[PDB]
């Protein structure tokens, strides 16, 4: 069934004077956001981001909410801590992010567990693959290391990673499995555009595909044009699917010598297409 993973992305952003730190938690199952918490509201609560999470009843949401609110307040604390660690003004805006999660094989066994922190967009501390020892990125991160060593936390966390995490992951998997395996095949077409002189540009489009992962190639008589082929980063169409393109500059009148190749997991087989002049 392939591997799986349950991760949480957390952001704490201070904003002195201008209100309380804005705090946010996002949960992903197999890189699909499924729940989210945003502390910027009169009554903030955890909420389903996948419709299939609505099978969970009020108790589930209450328990998650309360945990998130406790984290938030706790993160508000940490932010102050870090000002001191780093001897910074009380004035500035700062950021703490966290990624932590567990990934399990198709047999439901822990394949890898992790937790990395970042301060102001820079690595701060992480949990080694051994789930027992930390790794501080800078002097300040050792205060926190030597502090989590002395309250023994690499164990308390490994518990969650091997225990709670994997269990719930499995439960979430059961529920949204149908919609998680989702695949959308790219539709491809080639467009033709002018260049100066005797060159033209051929652009191979892939649209409406999901997941994001894709590969497009250009071949001159079947031999990829690795060199100076231009592409855009894969981008959301906004409706749940993605878009990408690759282009190359070819000689005018030589367009039929090139073939575009599209590889996506949704395809019974990769697409092959060419500039079609009407």
């Amino acid at each position: 069934m392939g591997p799986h993973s349950l991760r949480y992305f957390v952001t704490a952003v201070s904003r002195p004077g201008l209100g309380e730190p804005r705090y946010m938690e996002v949960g992903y199952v197999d890189d699909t956001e499924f729940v989210r918490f945003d502390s910027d509201a009169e009554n903030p609560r955890y909420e389903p981001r996948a419709r299939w999470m609505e099978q969970e009843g009020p108790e589930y949401w209450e328990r998650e909410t309360q945990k998130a609110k406790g984290n938030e307040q706790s993160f508000r604390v940490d932010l102050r801590t870090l000002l001191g660690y780093y001897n910074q003004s009380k004035g500035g805006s700062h950021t703490i992010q966290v990624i932590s999660g567990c990934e399990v094989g198709s047999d439901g066994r822990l394949l890898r567990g992790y937790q990395q922190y970042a301060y102001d967009g820079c690595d701060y501390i992480a949990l080694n693959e051994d789930l027992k020892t930390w790794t501080a990125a800078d002097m300040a991160a050792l205060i926190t290391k030597h502090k989590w060593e002395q309250a023994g936390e690499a164990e308390r966390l490994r518990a969650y990673l091997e225990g709670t995490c994997v269990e719930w992951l499995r439960r979430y998997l059961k529920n949204g499995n149908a919609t998680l395996l989702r695949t959308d095949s790219p539709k491809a077409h080639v467009t033709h555009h002018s260049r100066p002189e005797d060159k033209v540009t051929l652009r191979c489009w892939a649209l409406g595909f999901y997941p994001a992962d894709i590969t497009l190639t250009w071949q001159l008589n079947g031999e990829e044009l690795i060199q100076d082929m231009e592409l855009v980063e894969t981008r959301p169409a906004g409706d749940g699917t993605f878009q990408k393109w690759a282009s190359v500059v070819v000689p005018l009148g030589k367009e039929q010598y090139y073939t575009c190749h599209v590889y996506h997991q949704g395809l019974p087989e990769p697409l092959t297409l060419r500039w079609e002049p009407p």
Binding site: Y8, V10, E25, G27, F37, Y46, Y60, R63, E64, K67, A68, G70, N71, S74, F75, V77, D78, T81, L82, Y85, I96, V98, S100, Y117, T144, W148, A151, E153, R156, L157, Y160, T164, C165, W168
Partner: peptide
């Protein structure tokens, strides 16, 4: 579900 985070 979500974890409880240690203080830094």
């Amino acid at each position: 579900y979500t974890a409880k985070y240690p203080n830094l």
